[PDB]
Point group: D2
Amino acid sequence: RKPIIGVMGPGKADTAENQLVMANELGKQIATHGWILLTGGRSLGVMHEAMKGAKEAGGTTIGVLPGPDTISDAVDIPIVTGLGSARDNINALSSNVLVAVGMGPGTAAEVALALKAKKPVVLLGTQPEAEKFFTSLDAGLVHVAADVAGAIAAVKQLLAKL
Amino acid sequence: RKPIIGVMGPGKADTAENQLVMANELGKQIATHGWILLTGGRSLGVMHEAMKGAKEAGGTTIGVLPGPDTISDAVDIPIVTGLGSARDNINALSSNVLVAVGMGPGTAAEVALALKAKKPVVLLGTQPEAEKFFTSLDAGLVHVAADVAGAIAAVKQLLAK
Amino acid sequence: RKPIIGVMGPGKADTAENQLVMANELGKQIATHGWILLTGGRSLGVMHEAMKGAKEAGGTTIGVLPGPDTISDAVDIPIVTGLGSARDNINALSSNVLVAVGMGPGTAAEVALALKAKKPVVLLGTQPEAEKFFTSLDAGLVHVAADVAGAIAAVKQLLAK
Amino acid sequence: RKPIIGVMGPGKADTAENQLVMANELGKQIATHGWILLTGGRSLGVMHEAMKGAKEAGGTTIGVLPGPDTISDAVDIPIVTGLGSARDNINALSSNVLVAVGMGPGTAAEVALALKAKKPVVLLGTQPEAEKFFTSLDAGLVHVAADVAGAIAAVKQLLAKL
């Protein structure tokens, strides 16, 4: 069974370009390590980039969508859930590790839900407020990474322990 | 329609004793103001206290629960969802305002989801990091409350808007 | 607690005129028997008629809806779920009995899901194939009703058990 | 994008052996055609068999589960949904075609939901009552198949038209 790595980030308009770069590179390295990328299939911000990156590097991608899937070609496997744009809905109970790249309400909710699920989360491109808050929720499950390499190292290690 | 006030908070193990007392007092004040209380229908920290409070004050309560069968007399309208408890689903898109008493991963998810749905949230007895962080996600929708009465005043303001 | 009676049925386009009249009459009788009506809160065939009926008879209604914002005055307790409308989610695990008036794919799914959850379902104005088929899934939980009063009698029997 | 074929059937105790055979063979032929099998990952009746079949024949499998995934090794990609054993919950909005093998409450619900989603469904090993009822819901979307070959022909054709 290939490890499944989750990526979550804000959608287009509330995303710094450094985060799209970080997302795509992470994408790359997720695929490069032989891991499946699981992310939203909605083809906009951080997630689309991760998917482009994973797919470019030969990786298998999974794109979660809610409804009538009109979905980047970076997606290999669309999981259409039927639920809302409330999330974010919530299959990163499927990932071995979750990586957040940036932050916003949707991402915060999925990070919390993964902590609640006792899954480890790597926080990349988030701000002090987020890092501290999430580390306060579960210091044992939250890993702050300075950059993509750091994020990928955190993941590799968490996988080695499993 | 009576306003529906959503209450979120941690469970038995993770609710502090001061947070129980506040959740109970908040429940009471929700009822005394003529509002319906919506909260988790199985969960025994904050949510049970809130509901027990609303009820003692003669309030009407809606309890959201993931399924059968593990319900409290304190719950009037039991809504069984047949999703899981991966999410505290209570459902505060049903609510006019959401009040988080205390904090933890489940609560943090529901506060973040309300905000994502552009709903105001009142934060009571959440620590400084919760308050600063949620404020960082959406400063116009997050209201920090010092104590039950402040939380009630925030709720009233949001309702009168 | 008042019994909660779940009503399922097709939407505006697919509800026959006789089925509107029955759904309205069923709503009325749900209310007159002191039960709460639970049904879809956005859907304008059977479910709207049922709710309009309960309401005219002074009944209390719970409307389940997928989201904001597209609600009827006929709905007292609006429950917004923030799932989709891939499923009529109304939620009849919340209900004591489920009544399907008329039939179609959405209705068929909710009737099958109630049965899966070992809940009794009363089938009203569903055609012979619906009745025979659901009966084939679980004969002890499926009750065919000839008309509103028979459906009400079935419901009463299930409640008295 | 590989076509995703959905399979649904009753779980263990309410399943004739002819249906487990039919399920496994269908599984086989789904994989043999280069299609992804999407089914419940719960490792018991019709679905487990389909998965064993798909995996034996080199196919990629997707196993939907609700909760804390304690999940046959026939699953490649577990999608953990977080929802109930209410379903059945309900990602066969992801399949191009759905195949029911046998029938029971859970299966009936997913067939209906797929008809509601305007997706085509092939009914294999079901009884007259089911065939007629579902054909009455949407005659244009429901295909009754006498056997696995027939089921697989129905699918191939529906895919050709898409």
